[PDB]
Design a protein around this nucleic acid. Structure first.
Length: 155
DNA sequence: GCATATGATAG
DNA sequence: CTATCATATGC
């Protein structure tokens, strides 16, 4: 994706609320990217009342990790581009996407992202994205499903 | 366009 | 390490 269109694909083994909880609140409780303190990895991750991804740096708020357009409870999250305090590219992309959590049996949730405009920036814009984002959030989604897999299936 | 540099991708 | 690809700075 992210060259023609952006799609997200994640299967959660617990339910949509655990998915939403993990995705937007449980930032500090994963271990793929947030594996830090006052960094990418702090006691927050995202702001609920405004819809904006931030964590608690020692000097204030560490990395902005998204500009949320829609914070629609355990259901849907439309967010925009933002990344880690690393060797990253700036939010020159906007990269917005509709995170669609589909509740299955209320103990499973398949999320699909659908967006097509800023995400299409693949090739050039995605190569500068590759700087540090490629080694974080895509990795997050793996441990996301696994941490959650332990929440009500494995552990 | 070339020397950087950073960042990923080549070898 | 040199390159080669992209992007940006720097000249």
């Amino acid at each position: 994706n992210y060259d023609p269109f952006v799609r997200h694909s994640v299967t959660v083994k617990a339910d949509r609320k655990t998915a939403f909880k993990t995705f937007l609140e449980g930032f500090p409780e994963w271990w793929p990217n947030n594996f830090r303190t006052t960094k990418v990895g702090a006691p927050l991750g995202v702001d609920k009342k405004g819809g904006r991804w931030y964590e608690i740096d020692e000097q204030g708020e560490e990395h902005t990790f998204g500009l949320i357009r829609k914070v629609d409870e355990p259901d849907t999250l439309v967010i925009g581009w933002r990344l880690n305090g690393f060797g990253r590219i700036d939010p020159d992309n906007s990269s917005e996407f509709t995170v669609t959590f589909v509740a299955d049996g209320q103990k499973k949730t398949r999320v699909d992202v659908e967006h097509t405009h800023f995400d299409r920036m693949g090739t050039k814009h995605a190569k500068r994205v590759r700087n540090g984002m490629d080694k974080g959030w895509p990795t997050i989604l793996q441990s996301f499903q696994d941490k959650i897999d332990e929440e009500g299936a494995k552990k």
